[PDB]
Write a structure and sequence with these properties.
heterohexamer; A: 223 residues; mainly beta; Noncollagenous (NC1) domain of collagen IV; five-stranded antiparallel β-sheet; 17 strands; 0% helix; 40% strand; globular; E: 223 residues; eight-stranded antiparallel β-sheet; six-stranded antiparallel β-sheet; binds chloride ion; Canstatin (chain E); Arresten (chain D); structural protein; Non-collagenous domain of collagen type IV; A principal structural component of basement membranes
Chain lengths: 223, 225, 226, 227, 223, 224
Amino acid sequence: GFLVTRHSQTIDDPQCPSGTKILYHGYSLLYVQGNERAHGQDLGTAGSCLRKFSTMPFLFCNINNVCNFASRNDYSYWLSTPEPMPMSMAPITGENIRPFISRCAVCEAPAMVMAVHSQTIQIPPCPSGWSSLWIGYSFVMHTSAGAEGSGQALASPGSCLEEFRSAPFIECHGRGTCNYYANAYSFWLATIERSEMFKKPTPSTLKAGELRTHVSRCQVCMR
Amino acid sequence: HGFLVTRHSQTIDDPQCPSGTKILYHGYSLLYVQGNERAHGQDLGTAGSCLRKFSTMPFLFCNINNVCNFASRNDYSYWLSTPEPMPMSMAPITGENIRPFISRCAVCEAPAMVMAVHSQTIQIPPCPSGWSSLWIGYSFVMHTSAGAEGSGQALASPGSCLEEFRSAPFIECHGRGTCNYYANAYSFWLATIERSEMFKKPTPSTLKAGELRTHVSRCQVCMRR
Amino acid sequence: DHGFLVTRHSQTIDDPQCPSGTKILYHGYSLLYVQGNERAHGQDLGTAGSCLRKFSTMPFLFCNINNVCNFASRNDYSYWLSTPEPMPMSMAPITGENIRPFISRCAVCEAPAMVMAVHSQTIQIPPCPSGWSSLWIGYSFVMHTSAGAEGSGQALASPGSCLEEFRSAPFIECHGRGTCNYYANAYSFWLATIERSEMFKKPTPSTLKAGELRTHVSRCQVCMRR
Amino acid sequence: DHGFLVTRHSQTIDDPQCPSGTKILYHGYSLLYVQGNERAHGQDLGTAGSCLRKFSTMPFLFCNINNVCNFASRNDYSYWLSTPEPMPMSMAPITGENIRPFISRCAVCEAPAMVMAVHSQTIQIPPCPSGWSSLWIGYSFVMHTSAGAEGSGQALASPGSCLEEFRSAPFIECHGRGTCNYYANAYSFWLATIERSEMFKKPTPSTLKAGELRTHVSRCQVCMRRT
Amino acid sequence: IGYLLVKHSQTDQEPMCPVGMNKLWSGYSLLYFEGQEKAHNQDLGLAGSCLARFSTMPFLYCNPGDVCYYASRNDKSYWLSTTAPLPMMPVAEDEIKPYISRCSVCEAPAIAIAVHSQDVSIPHCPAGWRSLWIGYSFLMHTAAGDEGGGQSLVSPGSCLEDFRATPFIECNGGRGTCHYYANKYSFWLTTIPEQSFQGSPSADTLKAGLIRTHISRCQVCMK
Amino acid sequence: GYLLVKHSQTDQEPMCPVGMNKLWSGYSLLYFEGQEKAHNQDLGLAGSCLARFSTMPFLYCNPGDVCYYASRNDKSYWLSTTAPLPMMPVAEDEIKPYISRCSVCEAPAIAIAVHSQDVSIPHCPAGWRSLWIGYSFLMHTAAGDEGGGQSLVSPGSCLEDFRATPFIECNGGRGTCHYYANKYSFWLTTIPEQSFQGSPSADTLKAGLIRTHISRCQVCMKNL
Ligand SMILES: [Cl-]
Ligand SMILES: [Cl-]
Ligand SMILES: [Cl-]
Ligand SMILES: [Cl-]
Ligand SMILES: [Cl-]
Ligand SMILES: [Cl-]
Ligand SMILES: [Cl-]
Ligand SMILES: [Cl-]
Ligand SMILES: [Cl-]
Ligand SMILES: [Cl-]
Ligand SMILES: [Cl-]
């Protein structure tokens, strides 16, 4: 009973790739931050797909048997949509958060699923005897508040985001506010030419329109 | 039904896929990356610890203002290393001199599930009933280099089993194109635990050249029949 | 004169003049903080340690127990107070002699008595304590975080908590590689303006664009006895 | 005499002599920084707080909200400036009274005037400012990191940034269990020698082996104002 | 067959494998190691969390100078805790035994997953899956400093049978003692009263006895 | 002109010593927490005496010419009072009796803190006069690994009243303050030995048997 988790990066429920039956839908969870420590859910795994959304989907308990819910300064992070940031750059609150949160689908697969990386602008071909589920971009890691964050296993479908976003995730707080922040970095595999592997990498600052020219491509395959 | 196993040679040569498995692709052994002073690790037992192309900077970072920087800050990459010694001058290694330092890996398609068992002794652990051996090694658990940042291995993953014990099993590479070994680069191994000394207070031990493997736990990677 | 010292930062390429009542020792460049082995250590801007005679993108080296000292040989940082110089129109890192117009200049001055900074916590100027004369006015600069959220800060009694000119990005990030640049995570923290009546009330969230930045920034004054 | 203090660190087992013009208050042991619940907190070497009258591998305790205080019951550290005493040939933890010969001694001296440090950023000794008399010379000491890359540093204006004798490993790591040892991750950071010519260019990456160490370490001098 | 099911009893007695499943080994429930003030975690659902031989210090470290230290510095280990009452002083040598939770690795016919409700009610296994145990949604943990880690929500490790405010113990390797310290926090998923979306989470504090109703429930299911 | 800084550890402001003119009173600021990076003020220096209290007394800016106030998840830490530990986080006005008050005075001479590392109170060095007697306050941690410490020469390492929880956490956005279970206070110990301790013996102390293990201190001023 193999599983494949797919993220739409939009407000709509993503359809299961050709060959896989649907189990349940939910909201795309990237990572949580509790007591200033980041803990993540791998996007390729079903743990990145919570059935219910909350800016604070967790509480903490101590040795004195005292639990606190949304009482301190903790974070939750979800994959974001193409929904534009309000022009005032103000914290998004209440039910205005729904259009910002990505949706996901946990699908039952007849066989094992994997992701391949090219380290090139060209799409990496699937291994011999493996059929393609989807293509995308190489999503390695991310850091937001206190430069804390998590990443993805490069063999997992979670390292393969179907749609490239310069801001792929939104920061939500237990105070009930969500917003993009300047320190929210996203890390993607670089395009490396085979002839330049063991040469000094040439520094490149990429403007809008050139962003994906140095971003590696990926394909999620199933046997 | 599509199981995968990743082997690391710990040398400049490609490792051969263990008995029963078929080769998919070769590459370079990636341990962990460090971007914005934070470390993210690829488990050595998974295929993600094996990238087809090496770079001292194999990643870029993007911001909310739709700007992406490649090798434009101070970021790191960490790769499994070879028996190749550190130079005379102890200066940073750059250019095609890095090639003989980087380990090679192989991603192999397995017919059955792969796992690692640990003896916690100097003895090699036997494979469980119904399972067949692939390779033997030493119990590799975790590592820290710069800023005490790093990552670790799942103990039931083939990544926790390095075939050859190395005091320095990894090399530190920078976006400047320089790779070097550093004093703070630690490698954590499962120690040998005796049945008697389980709940007893552990005896402090300090081992030198030729005595290093005396307290290192042994492992075997097994695949079910 | 009992040996009291005050450091002024011009936040430009010109040397700052020693405030009235003090005499000049030496000039240099405004060092905010260094970062080695991914840990930040800073120098208080009011102290002479924030005023180094010589600039380098790597002004330090490290040594291990095996008697080996490495200089500009890992991935380390140095941070300097920055000039009004606009960021290049490519956001690409600044190298070589092109960095000089970006680095602030400082002056270490000898004061006859103790130097201190008062904070108003309003848009108004805080008055000097009775018997203390004013040296300069500015804005309340508390702390900063750049790479890996690591950074340092200023003591609110120290003159270094009082930058004469408010900057959104008061500091530039320099690397051992010989590259300096501004980055999106380089935050600068300033004391907020609060009203006496608002003190214990739940704070109202505010977002400030260009033209509204100094609206909620507290003011400060650096004073000297006798 | 308004109450000015100068702290001198011998970096030996001997009590350092107060520089010319100052009177001795008390002696002690050179404390660099403590590390409690994984956070490092440092005492500036130029201040009297870096000079503790009594030594311990665990000179502090901690307390929780339940009014329960633990002493030396967890995994916490203390860090002390060290002597030129050689590390044992076995390289094993040093315990008990065997620690004494490794711990540097300090002296807190009451000064008539304010004390500062000047840094040249060259191999040459920076002269004292106009109207300031020289107390001692040394090497520019900026910061340090040991366990979990946590540590602290010095203020470059403070005399604590001016260590008299250069050491590749200037401090030792002590644990609350009662053991002290030098470790491979213990780094010391010093100001580098910069030239006015290559002030705004690419810094040349250099690795220095034994004997070449002090060739790039900046020099300093602790000065005190004239009365 | 071929899958590894891991059971954590949360007691000083070893848990039994379900019918048809042959036991490989029983051990001690390992949460995470802490070396150089860095926490590396074992997923409670993976067989790595079940270490056969217990020690306060079960690891050692080496540097590039060909030197290995064992129990020579201030490193830590963390193990899943039993129901045993909280000791007044740090427990020593033989008295540690009733505090350490036991585990079992069982050989399984199919991959076992954990599903979460984020509700008061027990989530049901999807079509074609049978339930193994009912528990509580265990997300993450922090103990000494900022260090800790967490559990994958798809992994059966995120589903502990018994809810406990402090489900793990700190074992100080060198001293050979273990103890519950006040800075131990356990993070659990919450109950959301809505269908799928929660707007602004209301702050609350929960004393002993009123806790379990606000903790999310889970089931571990096998294909 | 040296500045003396007192912390009352009560909701009332402390009096300046006879002859020393009070510059201002305020609230005893321990440290800010921006971006989960703690920036501390030394309790012996006037910067710890913030004239106006707020749960969020700071804002932050980025190189995009944008500034945020109480918009993210930042913190502030303030020295605490004897006031009963609240069962639930206090809010708006009920915060008042929890925050310690301070005073900055104008001293003729420099004040220093001397530590005994012993049960007995240290006597001031020759030519120095006593100002107050306290306990040796070293360092603190609260949220994550974050916190900071006091300088042992500085009068701020000498708190007149010992408390295992000498500080409170004020959540800036929510405008609430509360004590949490991970708040540690670090104090120098009593060493029975003359000047050197070899192998420390681990100890756990319940309420009542604590204070006899805390190092004692005196804040002294030079005579002129
Ligand atoms: Cl919260
Ligand atoms: Cl880089
Ligand atoms: Cl090194
Ligand atoms: Cl460098
Ligand atoms: Cl940036
Ligand atoms: Cl301890
Ligand atoms: Cl070591
Ligand atoms: Cl240890
Ligand atoms: Cl505790
Ligand atoms: Cl805030
Ligand atoms: Cl709590």
